[model samples]
Target: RKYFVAANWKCNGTLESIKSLTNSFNNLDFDPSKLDVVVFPVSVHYDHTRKLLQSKFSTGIQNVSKFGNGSYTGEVSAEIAKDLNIEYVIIGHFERRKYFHETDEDVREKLQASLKNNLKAVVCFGESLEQREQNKTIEVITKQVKAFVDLIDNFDNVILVYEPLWAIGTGKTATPEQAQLVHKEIRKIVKDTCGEKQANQIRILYGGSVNTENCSSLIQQEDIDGFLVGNASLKESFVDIIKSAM
Candidate 1:
């Protein structure tokens, strides 16, 4: 299994911020072979981030369009992402679904586009606070995962991210037990749908309010593969999280 540590710099950072963060990361001594660490910066900094970290690590885009390129403005296409040599692309992040009104079908379309473009998808799925409060976490995640399972017909091209909406950027995280339960459930779903081999090969990650303080314990859970960090990613704390996973 490839242990992945992915950072989502969602709507944060300037050019200077990007350069500083990458410089600090480049200087750090990390086991690159054991850890597949990547940063998903805002689109504007993709070129710079890719160039700066080219030798050290990989970089991903925060979002990509479900529709192919034609006349869509303000959208990044999978072809363009492939041209950028991007190894990973985040699909169905909570912010994109909430703020941009992205639906499960939209995510499926994006996933297909990603596979067609030969880009690996770090697909995200989770329940909102209201949904969780109503005790619908499993149902929500089941539906989300099923959406992809139904569409793709193949699981080899995707990595799953389990991010509870309530925990995102809220300083609240899922307990290790809670995250483990959900991750196990997700893996079970994958096993049931895609077979045991594919399920075990899939990298299921935990995302939400993940910081330096909680990252070690979070990653220690058997089912939790790594992280999809948010705010804490902008700092050297992300490097700490990577080391913790090691």
Candidate 2:
């Protein structure tokens, strides 16, 4: 399978700033034949971003409602995403779980909704600094990931991301061996739940403080398929980071 690298520009960038950055993307030179790249900006800009890229690259939304439509005001549903020509939605990210208090059931519903509407999902699961210190990395993440295993019938359109809360925005990174162990473990969990074929077919990614400096070594790991880049995604160096995957 080809690598899938995504950029999550969470709460940053204005319309002008996004326009400027995407202009860079419009003319940014790189052959995407080696891998596919997806960008997740705030929902308001999804349409404009899509037109700017003009299918030169892919785009996704940061969040989506499980329900297709109704009086669930202020919510963007996966069905809406499909209608907008956006096919990817990120769910269960650590920030969403920490800030808004989303539960496992909430994430499952969103995943199911995305699948039903034909929108692929980038499902995130990870441990905090305290959880890791307490040796609960696998335990916590497994429960989060298991929900998807039980809810989704197939893993064909799912992208799994592991973002240690401790490493995120801390200028800290998990060593290649450290990150590789967790990724391989997640694959095993999938294998146990869905069989070996589906396990290898699902692409698992690593995020949190992923930068150009560490990206190369990180991508070489056996189980590390790609990245869910954060801050660096807004910079020109991102082009170099994408090339590293090749």
Q: TM-score of each candidate?
A: 0.96, 0.96
Clashes (N, CA, C under 3 Å) per candidate: 0, 0
Predictions in order: lDDT: 0.87, 0.87
The per-residue C-alpha lDDT of model 1 at residue 152 equals: 52
In the range 14-70, model 2's lDDT, one tens digit per residue, is 888888888776676555666778999998888777777757587899998977799
Candidate 1 lDDT over residue span 1-246, tens digit each: 778899898888877878888888887677777788888988888888877774668788999999888899998999998987987899999988999899999999999999989998999989998999999999999999999875554554688999999889898899989999999999999888878888988899999899888888998899998999998898876788888887
Angstrom error of the Cα, residue 107, model 2: value is: 0.7
List candidate 2 segments past 4 Å from native.
Answer: 31-33
CA deviation > 4 Å runs, candidate 1: 151-156
The C-alpha RMSD in Å for every predicted model, in order, reads 1.4, 1.3
